Design a protein around this ligand. Structure first.
Ligand code: DGT
Ligand code: MN
Length: 288
């Protein structure tokens, strides 16, 4: 047989991971198979952080970064050297990798905004430049859909001023993520400076509606435009990832027109599958 053959065996297919909806391991396994083609492009080359709920969303969960030796040997992996040590992460780059994610009850896949880059001579994978910016728009107390959308459109307009395109993704939880592919990749530190400059410019433009800082007392009635996830040490829920919440909602790509809907809400995994069939990947232009 082939040494590099990728195989995953689904166990406990009937096990309910979302008690509120009765969503099972098998549901999740089929979901990740269903979204593989559109999901993979946006996690390719990135260290994948997992959040796992072995007995579902009403039972304890844990983040996992290092790839355990018990994990399939055929999974791609690469190392990040940080201040305190060294971490070797999985890189999910095949449908069977996503099958492994399902089998792990890794409901959530989280990635940074940079990709590993192979050295010309050595071929060793090392962290490379940011390929895209992400903004996390977190609505504060009492912020309406009209305001959050208004703020998203303001971000998009400022980015267009600098020749960039913006893609909205409702997070699956409470807020809204905006991605923009960089014309020239730049260091994560540089990406973070740029993202910060954008958030501060918007805050200057609409200080009643937007904050660029974490400070808790300034949050009420404002959208927090979080630029800090562009840090190379930070990770953000991957597009098409499930969320480990009461319902199986998804970090779902949207159209700008959809954000114009006052009835805007998070989308469930079944809706996301139907939308892929109809429209393909709304994020097709974000990566590759
Ligand atoms: N403890 C821990 N926290 C993490 C890690 N990676 C990311 N986080 C935090 C920072 C991210 O903002 C967050 C990802 O999911 P959250 O629900 O907290 O933020 P998200 O923007 O997805 O939801 P929202 O739209 O604000 O309701 O988790 C990690 O490895 N360990
Ligand atoms: Mn948020």
């Amino acid at each position: 047989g082939s040494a590099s053959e990728q195989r995953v065996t689904l166990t406990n297919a009937d096990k309910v991971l979302y008690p509120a909806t009765g969503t099972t391991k098998s549901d999740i396994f089929d979901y990740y198979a269903g979204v593989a083609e559109v999901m993979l492009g946006h996690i390719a080359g990135r260290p994948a952080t997992r959040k796992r709920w072995p007995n579902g969303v009403d039972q304890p969960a844990f983040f996992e970064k290092q790839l355990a030796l018990s994990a399939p040997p055929w999974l791609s992996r690469a190392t990040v050297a940080h201040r305190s040590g060294t971490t070797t992460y999985p890189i999910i780059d095949s449908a069977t990798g996503l099958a492994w994610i399902a089998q792990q009850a890794a409901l959530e896949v989280h990635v940074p905004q940079w990709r590993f880059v192979a050295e010309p001579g050595s071929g060793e994978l090392n962290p490379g430049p940011a390929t895209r910016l992400v903004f996390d728009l977190d609505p504060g107390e009492g912020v309406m859909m009209a305001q959050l959308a208004e703020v998203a459109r303001a971000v998009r307009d400022l980015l267009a001023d600098i020749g960039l395109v913006t893609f909205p993704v409702t997070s699956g939880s409470k807020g809204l993520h905006l991605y923009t592919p960089l014309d020239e990749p730049v260091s994560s530190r540089g990406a973070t400076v740029l993202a910060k400059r954008v958030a501060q410019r918007l805050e200057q433009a609409m200080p009643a509606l937007v904050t660029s800082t974490m400070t808790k007392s300034l949050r009420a009635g404002k959208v927090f435009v979080d630029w800090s996830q562009n840090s190379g040490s930070k990770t953000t829920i991957a597009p098409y990832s499930l969320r480990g919440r009461t319902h199986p909602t998804v970090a779902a790509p949207r159209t700008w027109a959809e954000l114009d809907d006052p009835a805007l809400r998070q989308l469930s995994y079944d809706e996301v599958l139907t939308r892929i069939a109809r429209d393909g990947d709304l994020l097709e232009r974000l990566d590759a």
